[PDB]
């Protein structure tokens, strides 16, 4: 594998050979190759002590078509918006005509 | 002009059938489908001089005790390679083709 390096602190903090490797050996942790200096600079003190809209909720439309699922959400969001607008217009007209009829009677 | 209707006029005829696997089947014809699915009774079948698949197909039909004697065998159409008729039957009277005669009279 490229851009990888296998290393374990159990063989590095004990200061043994074979503490790093590039191949898949059982018991080693794979880290990145460019961050091995960041691994060596992290364990410095241990070595020093050793030395010293409300549409498409993705719950209903799961067993549906995966192809046209972008426009289907848009159509649902448009329908919800239209249903909200028709409700708002009805609520506005209900407090306008009846209010005028109350002013007339 | 299908000649399966020629074999439909061949009831109670004591024939042989060589199959595509290689088995020779000696028996009397009872009936034949228009898709040539022919049933036979009083049958003995033999694989001559080999093909181990044909020997397995010969033995695994019950009634072996390599001539195998069986009471009733239906044979599918695509497994029929050729069928040999008895020479005592007259082919000039069984191949009259009355359906073809009616089709020629209808023209």
């Amino acid at each position: 594998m490229r851009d990888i390096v296998f290393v374990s602190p159990q063989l590095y903090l004990s200061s043994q050979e074979g503490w790093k490797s590039d191949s898949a050996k059982s018991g080693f942790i794979p880290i990145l190759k460019n961050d091995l200096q960041r691994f060596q600079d992290s364990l410095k003190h241990i070595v020093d002590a050793r030395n010293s809209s409300t549409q498409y909720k993705v719950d209903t439309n799961t067993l549906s078509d995966l192809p046209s699922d972008a426009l289907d959400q848009l159509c649902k969001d448009i329908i919800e918006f239209r249903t909200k607008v028709v409700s708002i217009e009805k609520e506005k007209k209900m407090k306008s005509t009846y209010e005028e009829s109350r002013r007339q009677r | 002009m299908k000649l399966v209707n020629f074999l439909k006029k061949l009831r109670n005829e004591q024939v042989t059938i060589e199959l595509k696997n290689g088995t020779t089947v000696w028996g009397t014809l009872q009936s034949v489908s228009p898709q040539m699915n022919a049933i036979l009774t009083d049958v003995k079948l033999t694989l001559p001089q080999s093909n181990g698949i044909a020997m397995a197909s010969l033995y695994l039909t019950g009634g072996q005790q390599n001539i195998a004697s069986l009471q009733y065998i239906n044979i599918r159409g695509n497994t029929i390679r050729q069928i040999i008729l008895p020479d005592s039957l007259n082919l000039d009277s069984l191949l009259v083709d009355q359906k073809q005669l009616n089709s020629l009279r209808r023209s």
């Binding site: 719950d59 209903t60 439309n61 799961t62 067993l63 | -």
Partner: protein, 195 residues
């Protein structure tokens, strides 16, 4: 033309889009499930007894068998045998439907509980769970249940719930015993248990 043998309903010329939609609708599901349950119940409940073969028994077997003893036959009335067979049928069906579920509730605080036992983040059969949700196109089926889902995601780690005894667990269920043989339990316990 197409005819459903289950629902006893006809159809127009045989369209695959109509026939596929017919096997999804709820009436066909109910009729098919009830028919399979009743045919399985009939082939279980059919007591195909052997035809009896009684021969003229030997002489010395008759002088040995008619002199040993005569046993007593027990028998019950109609309502008693009806109630007993109904209790035996409900016991057989509740044993056929039950299963041991101790390993699911016994490894509940395990660090890999969300990767195997959750049955939705499972690898081999989790796509089958995520595929057919029964998407509840009726609004009443979604508005009926008002409880929590408690869907445990796969990303739950060991940092969450560090001490399993502080977060209140459940005491495990006792080993259940047979109610017909419940009168022979030791009535005196070994230790004093409070509450």
């Amino acid at each position: 033309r197409y005819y459903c043998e289950y629902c006893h309903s006809y159809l127009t010329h045989d369209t695959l889009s109509v026939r596929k939609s017919h096997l999804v609708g709820k009436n066909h599901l109910r009729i098919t499930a009830d028919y399979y349950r009743n045919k399985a119940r009939d082939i279980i409940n059919k007591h195909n007894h052997k035809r009896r073969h009684i021969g003229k028994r030997g002489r010395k077997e008759r002088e040995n068998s008619s002199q040993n003893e005569t046993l007593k036959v027990t028998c019950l009335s109609n309502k008693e045998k009806r109630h007993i067979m109904h209790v035996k049928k409900m016991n057989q069906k509740e044993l056929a439907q039950t299963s041991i579920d101790t390993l699911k509730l016994l490894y509940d605080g395990s660090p890999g509980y969300s990767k195997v036992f959750v049955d939705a983040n499972r690898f081999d059969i989790g796509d089958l769970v995520k595929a057919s949700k029964l998407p509840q196109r009726a609004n009443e089926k979604s508005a009926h249940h008002s409880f929590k889902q408690t869907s445990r995601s796969r990303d739950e780690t060991c940092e969450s719930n560090p001490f399993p005894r502080l977060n209140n667990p459940k005491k495990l269920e006792p080993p259940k015993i047979l109610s017909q043989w419940s009168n022979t339990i030791p009535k005196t316990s070994i230790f004093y248990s409070v509450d």
